[PDB]
């Protein structure tokens, strides 16, 4: 039937947070180490991911209630979910006609091959690309896209979470907002909520394979040295 002011407020907060941390001009990308097309794209993509991690952190800090988690819990959530949030938010540059992420310039058009030249295999890139395609076809409203990122960040079922109850309740509030939003505002969305929760499951699997391949990278110092300090901290295994 309708949404409450508290719920509508959450949507507004999330949408603003995302506009504040996602720059459609991609003008900052020239400041990364340039793309080169053994492992020639690793410097450029490591910089891209490092920058994106800062952006996800800025997004998280503006999720209602995230700030009020303990610092361990905030780190716990971010360490396990960063690569997933990056995969979600990257859908906004993904194009179906190119099967690539198009970030303004032709030098910042990442086809699948570019990502192979940064150390990954089709065991990751193939599901990643089909994931982007299925997600792009959902034709998500901005509100739904940002709600999913928030919901994904605030999953209590991450290793290292201590205040399980608090985070779960937060995630409950967001799911309720999403499920309500879709009902009232998304014409023909009767099945959209379940399609989105499935993508959260898909992201867990992409996280797993990514962590596998990142391990192989980081165990070769001649490649890990190309990463950034932020990437090493976030994707690393410290507790």
């Amino acid at each position: 039937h309708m949404l409450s002011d508290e719920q509508m407020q959450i949507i507004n907060s999330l949408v603003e947070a995302h506009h504040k941390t996602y720059d459609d001009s991609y003008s900052d990308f020239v400041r990364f180490r340039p793309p080169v097309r053994r492992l020639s794209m690793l410097p450029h993509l490591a910089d891209l991911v490092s920058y994106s991690i800062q952006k996800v952190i800025g997004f998280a800090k503006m999720i209602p209630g995230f700030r009020d988690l303990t610092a361990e819990d905030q780190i716990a959530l971010l360490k396990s979910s960063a690569i997933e949030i990056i995969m979600l938010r990257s859908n906004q540059s993904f194009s179906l006609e190119d099967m690539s992420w198009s970030c303004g310039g032709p030098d910042f058009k990442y086809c699948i091959n570019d990502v192979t030249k940064a150390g990954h295999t089709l065991e990751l890139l193939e599901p990643l690309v089909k994931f982007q395609v299925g997600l792009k076809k959902l034709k998500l409203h901005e509100e739904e896209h940002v709600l999913l990122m928030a919901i994904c960040l605030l999953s209590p079922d991450r290793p290292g979470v201590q205040d399980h109850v608090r985070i779960e309740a937060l995630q409950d509030r967001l799911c309720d907002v999403l499920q309500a939003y879709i009902r009232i505002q998304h014409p023909g969305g009767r099945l959209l909520y379940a399609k989105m929760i499935q993508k959260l499951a898909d992201l867990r699997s992409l996280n797993e394979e990514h962590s596998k391949q990142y391990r192989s990278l980081s165990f070769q110092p001649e490649h890990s040295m190309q990463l950034t300090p932020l990437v090493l901290e976030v994707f690393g295994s410290e507790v």
Binding site: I57, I75, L230, E233, E238
Partner: peptide, 10 residues
């Protein structure tokens, strides 16, 4: 550890 993350999280 998590020196950068703490800082960025303020």
């Amino acid at each position: 550890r998590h020196k950068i993350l703490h800082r960025l999280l303020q």
